[PDB]
């Protein structure tokens, strides 16, 4: 999930947009 | 865009800004 990807590691803007609706 | 570990409410606010009117889903469930 997002925690592992953006909290634990670092996320680009493009990886953040995968969690938009 | 910032290049940093976004956690807690900092990750949620980020999602709000980036998703806009689209809205988003926040499911921390590992
Ligand atoms: Cl903090
Ligand atoms: Zn803080």
Curated annotation (Swiss-Prot), chain B:
It comes from the Eukaryota. Changing residue 10 to D: In HPRI; Providence. Changing residue 24 to S: In HPRI; Los-Angeles. This is Insulin B chain. The lineage of its organism: Eukaryota, Metazoa, Chordata, Craniata, Vertebrata.
């Amino acid at each position: 999930g997002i925690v592992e990807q953006c909290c634990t590691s670092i996320c680009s803007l493009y990886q953040l947009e995968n969690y938009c609706n | 865009f910032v290049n940093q570990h976004l956690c807690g409410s900092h990750l949620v606010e980020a999602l709000y800004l980036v998703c806009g009117e689209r809205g988003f889903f926040y499911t921390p469930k590992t």
